[PDB]
Amino acid sequence: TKVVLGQNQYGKAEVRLVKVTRNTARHEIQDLNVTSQLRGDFEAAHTAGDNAHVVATDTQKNTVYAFARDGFATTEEFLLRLGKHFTEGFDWVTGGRWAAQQFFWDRINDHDHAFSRNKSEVRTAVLEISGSEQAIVAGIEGLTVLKSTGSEFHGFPRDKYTTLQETTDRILATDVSARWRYNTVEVDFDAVYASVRGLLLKAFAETHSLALQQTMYEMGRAVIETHPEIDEIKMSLPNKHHFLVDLQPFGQDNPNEVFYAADRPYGLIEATIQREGSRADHPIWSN
Amino acid sequence: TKVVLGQNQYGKAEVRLVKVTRNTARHEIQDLNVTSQLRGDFEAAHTAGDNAHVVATDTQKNTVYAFARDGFATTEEFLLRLGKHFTEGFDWVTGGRWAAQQFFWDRINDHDHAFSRNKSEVRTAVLEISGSEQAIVAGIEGLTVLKSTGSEFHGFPRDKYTTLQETTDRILATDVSARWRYNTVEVDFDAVYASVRGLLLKAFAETHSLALQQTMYEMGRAVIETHPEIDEIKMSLPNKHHFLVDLQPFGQDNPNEVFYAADRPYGLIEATIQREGSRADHPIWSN
Amino acid sequence: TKVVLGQNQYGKAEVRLVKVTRNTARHEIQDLNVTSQLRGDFEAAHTAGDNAHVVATDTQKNTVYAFARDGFATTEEFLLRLGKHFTEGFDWVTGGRWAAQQFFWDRINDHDHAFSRNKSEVRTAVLEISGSEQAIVAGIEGLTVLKSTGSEFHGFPRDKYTTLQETTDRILATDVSARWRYNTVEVDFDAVYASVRGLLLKAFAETHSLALQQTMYEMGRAVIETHPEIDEIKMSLPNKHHFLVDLQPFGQDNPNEVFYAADRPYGLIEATIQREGSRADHPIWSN
Amino acid sequence: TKVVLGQNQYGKAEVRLVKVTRNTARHEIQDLNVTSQLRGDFEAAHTAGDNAHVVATDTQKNTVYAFARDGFATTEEFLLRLGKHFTEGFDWVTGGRWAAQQFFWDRINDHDHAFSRNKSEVRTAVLEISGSEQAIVAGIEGLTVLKSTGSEFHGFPRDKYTTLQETTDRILATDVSARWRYNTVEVDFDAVYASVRGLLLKAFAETHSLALQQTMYEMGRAVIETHPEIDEIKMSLPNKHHFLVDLQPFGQDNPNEVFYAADRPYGLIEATIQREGSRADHPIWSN
């Protein structure tokens, strides 16, 4: 009977931007995939189609490029400028969500202006503004890692649907997806990103895994213990199964050497590791 | 300082199941992509690698196939059985999230056991159990629609970054992604899905759009006004731009006939249409 | 020592075009993904970077849109116009390859100007011109089909690496990728495409399969025998494995009802079915 | 007319294999995606469904894993072993096509058994056997490169549909897809692949480009001039457009700094650079 407009947001998604810094002959590249969405009083736009408050998504797009001209120190700094502009430049806009994927490039043999894409990982940044409050979540994704040994899985319950054999030596492969929330905007974003990445990789490799859950816990612990500016880190790790192929039918044995890497299904272990006392239901995780 | 394990879940994702009903010569096909994740007391698994509480993801997978053998009337009913099994079958498992994508098949010339895939839309379902509470969200995605006319966009604010021209005749194209939450388990799931789908399509097609936000609002309103078992519907609609090509440089006009369908960027309009007074932020939307 | 420039072609790939026919209130939609590439004397362009002979890819793109303005009866007709234009408009351009994917749309409840995408298949067309000769290849792809029974596979040889068990009842699922070459440009392209599509589906469903190879042969035979204008048809059919899950570990039998649909690996059966006495290696197949 | 079975092949595609070398504590990882297809007398299999000659695709898959157990120096030598096995093991199998993609892994902090994927490129290998002839084509794909300056495009003809403006400074970005055919199987496959990769990257970066065609020719020439064992190299290079955004409407200039990286359409430049006198159309290119 009675319908009500609830949470809503709109903007331009996936604006691909490449910013070349060329004041000197030593060029620099910043490659981003930017998304901008605004929140506020858009009631009339939905109920009546009145666009008085609707800053065109095309305009949001143009702004991204116009602002890039001035350059930016980091992806987070760029998003902060965009969010401030939209929330303060329009009275009916009270907040929003600005996000970006950053793609890395490497110089070709140290060339001044020739590069090749480093596709081994994608960096992410998300900024959410709510009234006078703002929060930033940085992250990494697409980083595939694997341990050929030093992984075990045993001691799990065995019901009538259990057939998995316990093992003290298996491959542990996953795609590192992690996002962490800063408790302050005054951060050396690039330095922390590189640090976290290294801590996650180190924790994954050096931890004698008794379960993906434990490896993940150790990865998150390393981050929280190293960075006071991070209140929590969320990780989503798939267990990309590498099955030890049965070679007995061919008169052979398989001493943990030949594996079939299955696409699906895959285990999916996810968890939030946080600083004792910190918030557990921050709105930025709602998207 | 003190590190703590927060929210967490784990299970098997993307178990591809195809259930053939062949008690009669008239075969039926059910094609699903199932994901099962458990929630409960998994503290020791994360902090010590103690897997006593860890029902193997492989076991969760086995359960999916064993349960499918008995058959299921609908995807939602299937997920309901899985959820009750894990929560009730293990004391330390207090809840979870079970989801599925349903893929449609049509018979080949009404053949008894020959079919072709209908890839024009994917049906989804998600069940979340939290203690004694159960919540179900059904949805539809991948349904691309387009109106060649009957779409306008004007009256939006113009700042120094606005270059978009107002229009009273443009193409409106989007991919319908919609999710709605049920307020009861006693629903004719298949019948409601077919109805919601038709209402969304009907509203999109019949509404003289003054904005994508308005079209979306009308789509949601129709669903809520029609089904008492639905408390809210969320939609994420991309505005897939079809640019009217300028052929004037060649001395040709273009009366809304020739368009360039750009990939990215795209407008992204999202909103929640709720039954007045219903829950504001149900946990199921968090994931 | 001595390096020579061999075969070469260039142009604009994937020009997304949507042509709306709206002379009457009953709108029509033609949605294409067009690729244009030219062949001829481009020696200097490659060896010296002299672009006198290089019709810009941007120009080829503009030409696609300019020509679309006049409309076109079929995709093949449209490609024929483009091919003729480039080969006759430039003396150094002696031929080329023009291709297109055609996407289908259905009216939403028979509405005059509102449609939804039919993603169950994609139609293709390729025109190749070489001097005074030209050839057209039409095709279909992305059409997934499945037989729940009426498929067998036994009688295959066994060696030390063979573990496969014979069967007289299995699921036969594949993706229909087929391409046929016309022996003349005087063809009712839309009618033949529809007919061919129907012949492939009919043969797939009605042939009691003893092998995917056999089914494929029957599909090709039906097409060649029905259409005089077709000299040969090439097919690439993956055998998408649907494994009958073993439920005995759970105390249940599985009377051909519960299957695991594996992504990879997959059988890949390919063959060319030809009209006796036709060309055996037409250049259009090289691409 | 009669219907005839023309060219045909069948086998198992995309068999994902991971081979771990672990004789010492210093583990090595070989990651491949293997495809096996046989050629020969399969007439009966197609026309009568007689599978006496049909070595099961499942058997081919098993053979890949069994052979993997013995280890292999390079991907090409692995394919050679497989190819010789099937052709020499079955009288009716006269040849075939074996291919593989090789995925790279780097150690995490020089760890003995912990690695991360290098996704910046994918190495490929294709072997075709025809009687006693063994033809091998190695290649690289997915390697995206970009030059921020040192690229021009002018002097092209301006026909009635040309709007592109001449320029002496633009971004040149592409995805390096190259394949080269060896004229002998006695090659240091890993060394040549590394050399070729370096030569392509070098030519791309150091060539002052007047056209993508020129940059490509120079890349191919460098390879042929350096490797006697290579008879020809084919390249397929997309011109991934990075449009210099017009910020003048916002009162700003854009000195080659802010770009929009478009997805489609894109220029597609392709060519074959051969050693003078070598085979014009080796059958392996048909696939």
Short mmCIF file of C-alpha atoms in Angstrom, two decimals, chain A residues 1-16 33 35 37 42-43 45-63 65-67 81 85-86 90 92 101 152-157 159 161-164 210-211 213-218 220-221 224-225 234 241 243 264-277 280-281 285-287, chain B residues 1-16 33 35 37 42-43 45-63 65-67 81 85-86 90 92 101 152-157 159 161-164 210-211 213-218 220-221 224-225 234 241 243 264-277 280-281 285-287:
data_model
loop_
_atom_site.label_atom_id
_atom_site.label_comp_id
_atom_site.label_asym_id
_atom_site.label_seq_id
_atom_site.Cartn_x
_atom_site.Cartn_y
_atom_site.Cartn_z
CA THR A 1 0.00 0.00 0.00
CA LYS A 2 2.34 2.74 1.23
CA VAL A 3 5.80 2.81 -0.38
CA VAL A 4 8.85 4.75 0.81
CA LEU A 5 12.12 5.70 -0.87
CA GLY A 6 14.93 4.28 1.23
CA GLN A 7 18.71 4.36 0.86
CA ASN A 8 19.81 5.57 -2.57
CA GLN A 9 22.86 6.84 -4.46
CA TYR A 10 23.85 7.54 -8.05
CA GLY A 11 26.81 8.67 -10.12
CA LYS A 12 29.24 7.72 -12.84
CA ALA A 13 30.86 4.31 -12.56
CA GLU A 14 34.20 3.20 -13.98
CA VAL A 15 35.72 6.36 -15.37
CA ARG A 16 39.07 5.14 -16.71
CA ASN A 33 39.26 3.26 -12.59
CA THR A 35 33.52 5.57 -9.53
CA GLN A 37 28.15 8.28 -6.36
CA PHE A 42 17.01 13.07 -4.24
CA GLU A 43 13.43 12.37 -3.17
CA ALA A 45 14.04 12.89 -8.60
CA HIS A 46 12.63 9.45 -7.78
CA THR A 47 8.99 10.27 -7.00
CA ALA A 48 8.43 12.98 -9.62
CA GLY A 49 11.41 12.85 -11.96
CA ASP A 50 12.41 16.36 -10.88
CA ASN A 51 16.12 16.65 -11.71
CA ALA A 52 16.74 19.94 -9.90
CA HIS A 53 19.02 18.15 -7.41
CA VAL A 54 20.48 15.67 -9.90
CA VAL A 55 24.07 16.63 -10.71
CA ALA A 56 24.38 14.74 -14.02
CA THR A 57 26.63 11.69 -13.92
CA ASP A 58 28.24 13.14 -17.04
CA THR A 59 29.14 16.21 -14.97
CA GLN A 60 30.59 13.98 -12.27
CA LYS A 61 32.70 12.37 -14.98
CA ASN A 62 33.97 15.70 -16.35
CA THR A 63 34.90 16.73 -12.81
CA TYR A 65 39.10 14.59 -15.47
CA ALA A 66 39.17 18.31 -14.62
CA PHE A 67 40.51 17.57 -11.14
CA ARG A 81 39.23 16.06 -3.15
CA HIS A 85 33.94 19.05 -3.81
CA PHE A 86 30.57 17.35 -4.25
CA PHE A 90 25.88 21.29 -3.32
CA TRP A 92 21.34 18.85 -1.04
CA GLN A 101 41.03 0.76 -8.60
CA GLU A 152 47.90 -29.28 6.78
CA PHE A 153 44.23 -30.02 7.42
CA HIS A 154 43.14 -32.62 9.94
CA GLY A 155 41.11 -33.01 13.12
CA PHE A 156 37.87 -31.86 11.48
CA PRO A 157 34.56 -33.53 12.42
CA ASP A 159 29.65 -36.73 9.82
CA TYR A 161 28.58 -36.60 4.51
CA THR A 162 32.31 -36.38 5.19
CA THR A 163 34.72 -38.16 2.83
CA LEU A 164 37.72 -35.81 2.85
CA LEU A 210 46.85 -25.94 10.01
CA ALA A 211 43.86 -24.31 8.29
CA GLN A 213 41.40 -19.81 8.75
CA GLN A 214 44.61 -19.76 10.81
CA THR A 215 46.75 -18.42 7.96
CA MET A 216 44.21 -15.67 7.40
CA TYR A 217 44.11 -14.85 11.11
CA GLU A 218 47.88 -14.55 11.20
CA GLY A 220 45.33 -9.96 9.69
CA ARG A 221 47.11 -9.99 13.03
CA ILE A 224 46.80 -4.71 13.04
CA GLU A 225 49.91 -5.12 15.20
CA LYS A 234 38.66 -7.89 6.28
CA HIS A 241 41.93 -26.64 -4.80
CA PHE A 243 44.03 -32.09 -6.35
CA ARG A 264 35.07 -24.64 -9.15
CA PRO A 265 33.93 -25.33 -6.53
CA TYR A 266 36.38 -23.67 -4.15
CA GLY A 267 36.49 -23.13 -0.41
CA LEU A 268 35.78 -19.55 0.63
CA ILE A 269 37.16 -18.46 4.00
CA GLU A 270 36.34 -14.91 5.11
CA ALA A 271 36.99 -12.98 8.32
CA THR A 272 37.36 -9.61 9.98
CA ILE A 273 40.42 -9.11 12.15
CA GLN A 274 40.23 -6.02 14.30
CA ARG A 275 41.75 -3.96 17.06
CA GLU A 276 40.15 -4.72 20.43
CA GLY A 277 37.58 -2.03 21.19
CA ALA A 280 32.31 -3.71 14.31
CA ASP A 281 29.53 -2.45 12.02
CA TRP A 285 31.15 -1.90 4.65
CA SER A 286 27.57 -1.67 3.39
CA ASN A 287 28.48 -0.17 0.00
CA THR B 1 47.48 -3.68 20.74
CA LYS B 2 44.99 -6.49 21.34
CA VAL B 3 43.90 -8.29 18.17
CA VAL B 4 40.42 -9.84 18.05
CA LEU B 5 38.60 -12.12 15.60
CA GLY B 6 35.48 -10.35 14.38
CA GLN B 7 32.72 -11.44 12.02
CA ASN B 8 33.64 -14.51 9.99
CA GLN B 9 32.20 -17.26 7.80
CA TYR B 10 33.45 -20.05 5.57
CA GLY B 11 32.20 -22.81 3.32
CA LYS B 12 32.15 -24.05 -0.25
CA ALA B 13 31.37 -21.60 -3.03
CA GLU B 14 29.99 -22.26 -6.50
CA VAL B 15 28.97 -25.91 -6.35
CA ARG B 16 27.50 -26.48 -9.82
CA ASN B 33 25.33 -22.66 -8.73
CA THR B 35 27.36 -21.50 -2.21
CA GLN B 37 28.90 -20.64 4.29
CA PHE B 42 35.16 -20.76 15.04
CA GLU B 43 37.50 -18.92 17.40
CA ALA B 45 40.10 -22.62 14.23
CA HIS B 46 41.38 -19.10 13.56
CA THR B 47 43.62 -18.55 16.59
CA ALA B 48 45.12 -22.03 16.95
CA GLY B 49 44.33 -24.04 13.83
CA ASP B 50 42.12 -26.35 15.90
CA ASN B 51 39.62 -27.76 13.40
CA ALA B 52 37.27 -29.54 15.82
CA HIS B 53 34.48 -27.11 14.85
CA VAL B 54 35.45 -26.94 11.18
CA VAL B 55 32.89 -28.87 9.13
CA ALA B 56 35.00 -29.28 5.97
CA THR B 57 33.94 -27.22 2.96
CA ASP B 58 34.24 -30.52 1.05
CA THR B 59 31.63 -31.99 3.43
CA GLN B 60 29.35 -28.99 2.81
CA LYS B 61 29.75 -29.70 -0.91
CA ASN B 62 28.87 -33.39 -0.44
CA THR B 63 25.77 -32.36 1.49
CA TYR B 65 24.66 -33.21 -3.83
CA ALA B 66 23.21 -35.70 -1.35
CA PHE B 67 20.29 -33.36 -0.58
CA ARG B 81 16.82 -27.40 3.90
CA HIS B 85 20.69 -28.95 8.44
CA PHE B 86 23.93 -27.16 9.28
CA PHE B 90 26.14 -28.72 14.78
CA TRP B 92 28.72 -24.54 17.44
CA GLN B 101 22.07 -18.75 -8.98
CA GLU B 152 13.96 12.43 -21.24
CA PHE B 153 16.60 14.14 -19.13
CA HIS B 154 16.54 17.87 -18.51
CA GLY B 155 16.27 20.34 -15.65
CA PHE B 156 19.49 19.19 -13.98
CA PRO B 157 21.83 21.78 -12.40
CA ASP B 159 28.00 24.10 -13.05
CA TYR B 161 31.87 21.18 -15.34
CA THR B 162 28.51 20.54 -17.02
CA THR B 163 28.56 20.03 -20.80
CA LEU B 164 25.63 17.62 -21.13
CA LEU B 210 12.08 11.75 -16.94
CA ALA B 211 15.05 10.17 -15.17
CA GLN B 213 15.76 7.33 -10.82
CA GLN B 214 12.06 7.78 -11.61
CA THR B 215 11.80 4.65 -13.74
CA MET B 216 13.50 2.67 -10.97
CA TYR B 217 11.13 4.14 -8.39
CA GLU B 218 8.10 3.09 -10.43
CA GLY B 220 10.02 -0.86 -7.13
CA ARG B 221 6.65 0.68 -6.25
CA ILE B 224 5.81 -3.63 -3.28
CA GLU B 225 2.22 -2.64 -4.01
CA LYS B 234 16.79 -2.98 -3.98
CA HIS B 241 24.94 5.18 -22.76
CA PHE B 243 25.40 8.22 -27.95
CA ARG B 264 32.50 2.51 -19.88
CA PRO B 265 31.96 4.75 -18.13
CA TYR B 266 28.28 4.31 -17.31
CA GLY B 267 25.82 5.95 -14.97
CA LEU B 268 24.96 3.80 -11.95
CA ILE B 269 21.67 4.55 -10.21
CA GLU B 270 20.75 2.53 -7.13
CA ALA B 271 17.87 2.67 -4.67
CA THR B 272 15.84 0.81 -2.11
CA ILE B 273 12.05 0.94 -2.32
CA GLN B 274 10.50 -0.16 0.98
CA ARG B 275 7.10 -0.95 2.44
CA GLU B 276 6.45 1.96 4.80
CA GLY B 277 7.54 1.18 8.34
CA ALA B 280 15.48 -0.04 7.73
CA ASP B 281 18.73 -2.03 7.53
CA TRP B 285 22.17 -6.94 3.01
CA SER B 286 25.60 -6.77 4.68
CA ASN B 287 26.78 -10.24 3.64
#
